[PDB]
Amino acid sequence: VQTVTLIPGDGIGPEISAAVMKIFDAAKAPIQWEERNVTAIQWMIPSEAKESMDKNKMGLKGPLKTPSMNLLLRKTFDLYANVRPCVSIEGYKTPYTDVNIVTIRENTEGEYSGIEHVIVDGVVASIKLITEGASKRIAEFAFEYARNNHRSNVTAVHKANIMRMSDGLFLQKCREVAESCKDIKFNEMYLDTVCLNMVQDPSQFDVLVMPNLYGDILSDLCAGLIGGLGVTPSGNIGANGVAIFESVHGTAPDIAGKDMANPTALLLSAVMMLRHMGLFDHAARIEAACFATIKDGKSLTKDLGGNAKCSDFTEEICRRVKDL
Amino acid sequence: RHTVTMIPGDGIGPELMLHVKSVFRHACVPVDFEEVHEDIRNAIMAIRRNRVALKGNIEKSRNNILRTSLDLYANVIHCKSLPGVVTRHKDIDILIVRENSLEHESVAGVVESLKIITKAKSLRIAEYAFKLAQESGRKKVTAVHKANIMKLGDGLFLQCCREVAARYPQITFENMIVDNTTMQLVSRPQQFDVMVMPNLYGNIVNNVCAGLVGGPGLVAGANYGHVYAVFETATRNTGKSIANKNIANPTATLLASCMMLDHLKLHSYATSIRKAVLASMDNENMHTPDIGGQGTTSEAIQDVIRHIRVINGRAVEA
């Protein structure tokens, strides 16, 4: 039995968090949940949340309200890798049906400094940061992710023809790491070509590694291909073995307490969490049960969009996962 | 009779310009092309004689020296669905406007890059997008930005779009974070009309849209200054592998030459040619390899000419 820090979050967070905890129970997942609130105080995160996470190493986070509370978590646990698997969902048709992509985004540097200067009146310079160490670290992560998740191919996304020094450096570290892992097939592609190919045939991509700003945009483009943030899982991997898995959809205040919310994103984030800690057999069962439920379509919640309550959708997943 | 500079360019550039001339000659378009190719500064002097150029693609950088010397500050691409090319999305019609590097190593291993936003250029591009939206009867301009993360710089750009929007109260003004934009583009791209954005996002958004309507071979662009305009294809690839093989897609070049015609106020010719290329593109046998067909550019041009009705020296409605 493994303890996982659970941050319900705001709005529908408690509701969809309940659904995931129920489903994990039905699946007999060896997981027990340490619920923590993280609303920022003083600027810091509560003692009681910070201790659990340092000890438990695994965290599951619902949606938060809007210094950002996500920003504090990133600084606090040094969450340097943002990971987003994007897979088309049978039964939730979008015009892109063979998407199976993992975006991996350097999450500490780039223009998220907030560093910006008025040079003279009417002229602003924003400052983007790239470092050798972070680029090496995110590339090592993308190759390790490839190996542990049976991915064949890592593509580095860059504009190293335009930004020779900053993207060239990021590219140079990916290549250096690729020489040590010929296990995985490595190639590199210009941002603009990636965007084109993303809409023309996303089925060609496997694992995409990229600096912070590109990843922020392409990870949302990929989520758009498969149906939006409501069905996208997401992980943040940090230092000291901590990893926080999260909903990236909004809190949805309009529907907060009405048994209407869609727990798929969080659930698949939890499935992502199981895989990160080696519990593949449970991840497989829980994921199958959820996909089988969406494919059936009888119990879809309103945004997926059936005529069903979170409860019924959650109950169906529990039903199906008890049969293995 | 207008005189228009023609830059053949590299790769597929020259063979497409011959096809453009052929179509124009058949359409009896009153335009004469003067071809143009330090020598390049002398080439620019020649280009500067005429206020309009049509150019194929090329390649401190020639294409950027071009836009400097002609002071072409606005890049515009026109992403429009062609009904005969069926993609995943239909009825898209988008004008993407954007303004046409500073790095150092602080300490070993640490690189810093500077992105410049200026009030003066933001206002100029925003005015361009709003004038454009008005001139062409478009109802909406959407500013695309990342002001949530880059508060001063994209904030300044957004603020300049707001000042200009205030002088065009009859145009809806929308502003949208670049991430949400790319999400909206691959799910409901019909909501968009005129988009204006700083340079970096235009790379992403241009190629998303081009892909949404079927590929860059279908998409015309232009660069505009206060006096000069240069008309080109949206993407700058020269097609060097696919050159002299009678395989390049003529659509974007023909459509660029139509938006050059409208700029010269030769509307009846532009409409006639443009409807001819759209009607030709209803026949899948005229599609070239890059959009998934098996046709040759020769067959496609021949079909475009067959769809241009010319009566007494002038192009007419079919």
Numbering used by the authors:
A (entry chain A): 4 to 45, 51 to 74, 81 to 338
B (entry chain B): 15 to 51, 59 to 80, 90 to 130, 137 to 354
What does the paper say about this structure?
Human NAD-dependent isocitrate dehydrogenase or IDH3 (HsIDH3) catalyzes the decarboxylation of isocitrate into α-ketoglutarate in the tricarboxylic acid cycle. HsIDH3 is regulated allosterically and/or competitively by numerous metabolites including CIT, ADP, ATP, and NADH. In this work, we report the crystal structures of the αβ and αγ heterodimers and the (αβαγ)2 heterooctamer containing an α-Q139A mutation in the clasp domain, which renders all the heterodimers and the heterooctamer constitutively active in the absence of activators.
Crystals of the apo αMγ belong to space group C2, and the asymmetry unit contains one αMγ heterodimer, which forms an (αMγ)2 heterotetramer with a crystallographic 2-fold axis-related heterodimer. However, in the αMγ structure, the γ large domain exhibits an approximate 8° outward rotation from the α-γ interface compared to that in the αMγCIT structure, resulting in an “open” conformation of the allosteric site. Crystal packing analyses show that in the αMγ structure, the γ large domain is involved in close contacts (<4 Å) with the α large domain of a symmetry-related heterodimer and thus its conformation appears to be constrained by the crystal packing; whereas, in the αMγCIT, αMgγ, and αMgγMg+CIT structures (which all adopt the same space group), the γ large domain is not involved in crystal packing and thus its conformation is not constrained. Nevertheless, we cannot exclude the possibility that the conformational flexibility of the γ large domain may play a role in the proper function and catalytic reaction of the αγ heterodimer and the holoenzyme. A detailed structural analysis shows that in the αMγ and αMγCIT structures, the hydrogen-bonding networks at the αγ-αγ interface are different from that in the αMgγ structure but similar to that in the αMgγMg+CIT structure. Specifically, the α-Q139A mutation makes Ala139A1 unable to form hydrogen bonds with His131A1 and Ala139A2, and similarly, Ala139A2 cannot form hydrogen bonds with His131A2 and Ala139A1. In this study, we found that the αMγ heterodimer is constitutively active regardless of the absence and presence of activators.
